[PDB]
Symmetry: C2
Amino acid sequence: PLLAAPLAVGDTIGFFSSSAPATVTAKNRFFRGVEFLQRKGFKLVSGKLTGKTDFYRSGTIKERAQEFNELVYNPDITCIMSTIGGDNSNSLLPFLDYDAIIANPKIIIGYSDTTALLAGIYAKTGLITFYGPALIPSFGEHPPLVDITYESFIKILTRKQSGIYTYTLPEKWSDESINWNENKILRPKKLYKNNCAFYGSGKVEGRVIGGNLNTLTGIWGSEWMPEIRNGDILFIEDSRKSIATVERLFSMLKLNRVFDKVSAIILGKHELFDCAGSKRRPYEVLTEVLDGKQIPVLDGFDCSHTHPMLTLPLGVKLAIDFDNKNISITEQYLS
Amino acid sequence: PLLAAPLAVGDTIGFFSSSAPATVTAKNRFFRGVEFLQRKGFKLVSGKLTGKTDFYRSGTIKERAQEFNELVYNPDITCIMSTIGGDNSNSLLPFLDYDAIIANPKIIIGYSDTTALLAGIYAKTGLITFYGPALIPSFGEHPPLVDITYESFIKILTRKQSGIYTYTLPEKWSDESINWNENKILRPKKLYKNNCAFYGSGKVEGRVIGGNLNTLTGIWGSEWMPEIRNGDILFIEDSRKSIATVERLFSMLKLNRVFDKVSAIILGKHELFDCAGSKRRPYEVLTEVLDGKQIPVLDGFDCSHTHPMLTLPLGVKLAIDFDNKNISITEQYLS
């Protein structure tokens, strides 16, 4: 695989808005994120669409592609970070400079809609990209949860590439929809004990592939969708979806013979899942769709829209030990 | 292609609920639709899940597949009609009795989520299925618009299969979300003059393929998605989507090389499109996504979630005359 250089404190991070114009619509949270990373010692370069709006998006398809490409061309940038997701990053894919990415690999990181770019770039270049923090939703989060997010971010991206890395388990988490873009908090978010579950036995090791499942529908079938291969671990997360939508997306995977290929499935915690009064969780829906197929599942991995968020390299081998209830990165993911 | 026997006055229509349990949740409209078709002289067979609920759906995946299969097995039934869409018909596809469908061809008709079944059945069997009325939303519609829907339904399905059929243009249409599930209208719907537009020149003839675009994402990449070929006419419609979602879906098609293949595009009228204040219409978004690729477009065909609704056979040749502003079926679609 193509590997980027590791991050270091003091490096320059460039940010881009490939979809929603949240540097404008969530300006307070944006400024909190900027200040948070600057206090950590990072220099920040603002993408050319920062502070711009085109109603539902930051700019035209071509302008958004240019914003991203210009960060790739900047030799001072070691990390290219999404500001926020949305709906529209898949539009950029024909216009990204994949050759420039190959020529100067960098850490590319984000989540949700940005999945289209993370997966598309991997498909075209083999670059190991990262499902992880976006500037506004992740680093604009108030303490204490932002600190746990940052701890994972900095650990994953700066650690020495020797031996496996076993993920820490966040003690508490939240998906409560408060303290988004307000300047001062009235109360901290409701905290829940970590209820992640390991369904299966033994150890499973394989290349992790996926991201935001709803977003994957925007690139599915194309040359930008990385091929899922025998032995892959499928990582999928979604946010604020109805149980109806979740069934549809799981069945899509089934129809595509994905469940005949994968060695395990990681379900990210589903932010504010709407069960339609059924009291069913996504895992139960998956179980019905699987129709007897014995695939081990890590249900509730903290790499999703919930806080805090862990950083996950995509396209490298992970080992899930279902007996010891842990998950590790086992393949080198930075140079 | 495999062709079903034509419909006739006095025939038996069977209905099924492959997703949303609207025979319960929209029972008044359901009863009005039933009465409407009965007064036209049709005999109705209720699918086994009529009157049942499993929260967001009519029943389990297997229960829903069984309901559909049971109608296929009934020799008295000439037409199998969806009650309503939803989100979840794609789940049924591994469990449909395709051999029985081939052995006992029938008119299969519906829209929206039912696209998964219409396209999936065509992909597996070559049967010409129909994008058209569902019992509850279409035939439960209050006068005057239901009569225009019915006129197309009965004309398309009962007419002699000799010579081309040129579609009538509804004089007025509406997309208002009122008068859904009550005995009486609150007030009459706004009636719009028909503003469909023919972008391009000359005549394009090709096999029509598609349906509800959002729904197609649930079968995309699988053996149930019919292959789009050079010269095809793409038919797509969506309902109540944001401009953000519409851009995403159009870009999905672009990434899949669909716009390198198709000779024309038909856009169904988009029910209550949300432009996010941009004042842009779906055609403008399509134009940006196309990036200079010249494809003639029929913008605003009355075969969608708007009322009234025309009946369209899928998988047969149509001819769009962009100079004379009309659209015709040119290939036999029933026995």
